């Protein structure tokens, strides 16, 4: 229903705890939270967590 | 020989074997320092790059 931003990983990132989201370059992430401070939140393959906002690029809807 | 050692403030996980995973409290022996936010060091048998602002200088 509600609109949702989609981003694609520019680089690999490996989570250090369960509140962070791991991904490989190219993975498609559905964004749930955007905030200042270097981290955004999103979902990937049934997992949710925070990731570096500078590690992703936008996807044109 | 004098050596530079740093202590991890935060956890970091490698994305490949040229990078060094560590846990908060680990002491790392620095092997290379460069501009750009990445340093290289050795911990417990492995050597790799890691974020410089995840660690703090200590003394051996």
């Amino acid at each position: 229903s509600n609109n949702q931003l989609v981003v694609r990983a520019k680089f690999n990132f490996q989570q250090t705890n369960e509140d962070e989201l791991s991904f490989s370059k190219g993975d498609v992430i559905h964004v749930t939270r955007v905030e200042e401070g270097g981290w955004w939140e999103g979902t990937l393959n049934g997992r949710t967590g925070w990731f570096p906002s500078n590690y992703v690029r936008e996807v044109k809807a | 020989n004098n050596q530079l050692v740093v202590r991890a403030k935060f956890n970091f996980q490698q994305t490949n074997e040229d990078e060094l995973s560590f846990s908060k409290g680990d002491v790392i022996h620095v092997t290379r320092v460069e501009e750009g936010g990445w340093w290289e060091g050795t911990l417990n048998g492995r050597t790799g790059w890691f974020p410089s602002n995840y660690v703090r200088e200590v003394k051996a």
Binding site: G37, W50 | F10, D18, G36, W38, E40, W49, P51
Partner: peptide, 21 residues
């Protein structure tokens, strides 16, 4: 046997972990 390791990762380092107010 000190090997030759590569340059810094070409990507920027991740920021320090999130710490909300």
């Amino acid at each position: 046997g000190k090997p030759s390791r590569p340059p810094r990762p070409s990507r920027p380092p991740p920021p320090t972990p999130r710490r909300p107010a």
